[PDB]
Amino acid sequence: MNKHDAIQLILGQFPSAYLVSTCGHISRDLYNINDRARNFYMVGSMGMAAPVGLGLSTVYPDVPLVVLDGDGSFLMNMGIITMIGHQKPKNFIHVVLDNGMRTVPLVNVTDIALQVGYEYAIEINSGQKSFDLPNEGPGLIHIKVEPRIGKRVHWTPQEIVQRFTNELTLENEV
Amino acid sequence: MNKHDAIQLILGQFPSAYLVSTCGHISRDLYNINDRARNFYMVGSMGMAAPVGLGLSTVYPDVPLVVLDGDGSFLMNMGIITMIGHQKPKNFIHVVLDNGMRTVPLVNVTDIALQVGYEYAIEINSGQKSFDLPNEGPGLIHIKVEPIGKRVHWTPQEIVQRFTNELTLENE
Amino acid sequence: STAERMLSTLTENNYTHFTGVPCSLLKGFFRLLESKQNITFIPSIREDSALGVASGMYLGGRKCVMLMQNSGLGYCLNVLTSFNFIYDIPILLLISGEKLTDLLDSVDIPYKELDYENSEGTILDALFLIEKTNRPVAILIK
Amino acid sequence: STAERMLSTLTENNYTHFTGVPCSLLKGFFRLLESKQNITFIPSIREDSALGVASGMYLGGRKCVMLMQNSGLGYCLNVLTSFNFIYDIPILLLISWRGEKLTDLLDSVDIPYKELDYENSEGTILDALFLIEKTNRPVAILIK
Structure with a gap:
């Protein structure tokens, strides 16, 4: 399963969610899969997808929000989880696409998410x-993804x- | 206990350790309690004591250094632990003096430090x-601490x- | 006092959402924000995260402001230059000199200086400029 | 090969402790440090922690570089101005990008810099270095 497959999996599981995608291959992949008006792409600002998503889930607590x-x-802005776990937004989904083989490894992310107050944390290795x-x-x-394109x-x-x-406004209050 | 007593305690268990205190009241307390030449006081640069301490451990693995x-x-620079747990400095000690009651609460810090690769992570209340x-x-x-000064x-x-100076002398 | 006089204008101009890091210099406003009128305050671990949360709130159709200090400005810089000035997401910055405004105008963020007896002419000048700009404008303090 | 040349130059002058957050723009340089000179490389999560551990390794007697992208500058800008300069700790920074606004900023905070020559920018590696020895302070070179 590459990032393409993982993003298609997330989209199939949260078809109506608003997506905040971190800059880089993840945003480009998501755009090529299905450019929906509910996809908020980041052009840069690595580390800001999760804060922006947290603000969004604060203002709109009842709508599903997926951060990619x-x-x-x-890892660049790990501290964000402390706020996410303290605010406890009920319709917030933090996806971590991890292609670790050289770098600081990502270890025990689900355990740590639970430690800081997340309601649940799971790991997926293959298409289920x-x-x-x-x-x-x-x-x-x-x-966990294995990297392998895209306009x-x-x-x-x-x-x-x-x-x-516009999508957000019209599909809630109006 | 108050922060004065807490850092008195840590100095008691690492008397030869090379301190690197964070900015704010913690530095001032470290000094007025007792300034040792080997204490590092930080003016400003919040969230930086731990990285520069990690650098010190990296170059000098065999010297006890406790970061305050x-x-x-x-919380301001939590991700540094993922580096501290990755590099695994064998004489690095990471002290967190915490005041809880407003603020983002520090929760389950010992478990998290153990999850990222620290060798140990303990909590000291004043009773023990x-x-x-x-x-x-x-x-x-x-x-965890319950809160003057020169x-x-x-x-x-x-x-x-x-x-x-002291550090350059000691490997020699 | 000076604190409440500020807050009231902002809170009835639809500015009921605020982020920031707790800190001694603007302690009174954190005081009032967690004192009470409906306000939502999000304590933040660091300034860049406060900026991201504020930007997300704005995307939720909510006008908001972030309290901070000069030392934190560095952390937000790239964000401001790579996100809010690119997406045109206005956030009011009440940043609490030479170096500061030199840096600001070198990377092009409008700023104003608040005078305490005349609280609103600075803040409403800033609000008007963010309305013209749809970009963050800074309000400066001692 | 061009990256091979710069690092082969750098080892000789006793700069062997390198930090920075890995990224695909300096992909070749980084790949050189990962493979195998007593190269010491500490991968970082973000730029301010990289500058921190680089400072520390400096105070440990050794002399250190920091790889960084243009975007990273802000994350450490404050610690450059409010820690390195007043505590007088020098670090050599190689800020990469893709420009003018970046030099704007470097001038704003009193950080010297110079762009890399086609062939050999040893010129400002050691200009950098002698400014370091002169000034108590860090300096940067800018690439791509």
Whole structure:
């Protein structure tokens, strides 16, 4: 399972969720899979996907929100989990796409997520028929991927903002 | 206990250790309790005592160094533990003096330090008088504390000259 | 006092969301934010995380501000230059000199100096500029 | 080969302790440190911790570099101005990108710098170095 497969898996599990994708291969992959108006792509600011997602889940506590981190973006701003685990947003899904073979390894991420207050944390190594996820977050999904392309994302950041927030506004209060 | 007593205690169990205190009240308390030439005081640069301590351990593996952090300075740069647990400095001791009641709470820090690769991680309340410290690092000591003072009167290069002299002498 | 006078204007201009790191210099405003009127405050471990949380709140259609100090500005810099000035996500920054504004205008973030007797003319100048810019503008303090 | 040349140059002047967060822009350089001179490389999670451990290894008598991307500058900018400079600890930084605004910033905080020559930027490796010995302070070189 590569990152392509893992992102398709996450999309199939949370079809209606708002996605905040960390910058790099993860955002480009997600865009190429299915560029939905509910995908908020990061062009840079490695380490900010999870804070932005936490703010979003604060303002909109009832809507499902998936943050797509890599091992790098996760480790760069690890402290964010302390706030996520303290605020405890109930519809927050922290996905960590981890392609560790050279680097600081990502170890015991699910245990640590549980330690700081996450409601659940699971690990996925291969494509499974199903996995039952507790409907109440915050939940961490650690997915081990093996890297293997894709058109560069053709939306200006302002257009991303407008599409994403328009979707958010119209599918809740209005 | 108060922070004065906590760092009196840690100095008691590592009397020969080379301190690297974090910025704020912890430095001032370290000084006015007792300044040793080998203490490192930090002005500003919150969340940096632990990385520079990790560098010191990396170059000098056989010297006891205890980094002093608060809950705030620890949380501000938590990911450093993943490096401290990865490099595994055998004489690195990581102290976190924490005040809880407002703020992001520091939760299960010992478990987390053990999960990232520390050799041991312990919590000292004021009641116990033994607190058996394992004889290898990296070790995390979590002293929850219940909270005057003289401004420390030494400029940054005073502190670094005092510090690095003793260290350069000792391998020789 | 000076604190409440600020908060009231912001809270009735729809600014009921605030992030920041607890710290001695602007202690009174953290005081009031956790005193009480409905306000949502998110304590943050570091300034860059506070900025990210504020930006996400803004994306949730919520106007918000982040309290901070000069020393933290470095941490936010890239974010401000690579995210909010690229996505046009306005956040009010009440940053609490020469070096500071030299750096700011070198990387191009509008700033103003608050005078305490005339609280609102600085903050409302800043609010107007963020309305014109849809970008963060800084309000400076002692 | 071009990265081979710079590191082969660097070992000789007693700079052998390197930190930084791995990334695909300096992919070749990093790959040289990972394979195998008493190269010491400490991978970091982000730039401010890298600068911290580099400072520490400096105070441990050894002399250290720090690989970093342009984006990383902010994360350590403050600690460059409020710790290194007032405690007088020098580190050599090689900030890579992809420009002008980055030199803007370096000038803003009083950090000297110079771009790398096609062939041999030993010129400013040791310009850098003698500024280091002159000034009590870190200096950077900028690549790509």
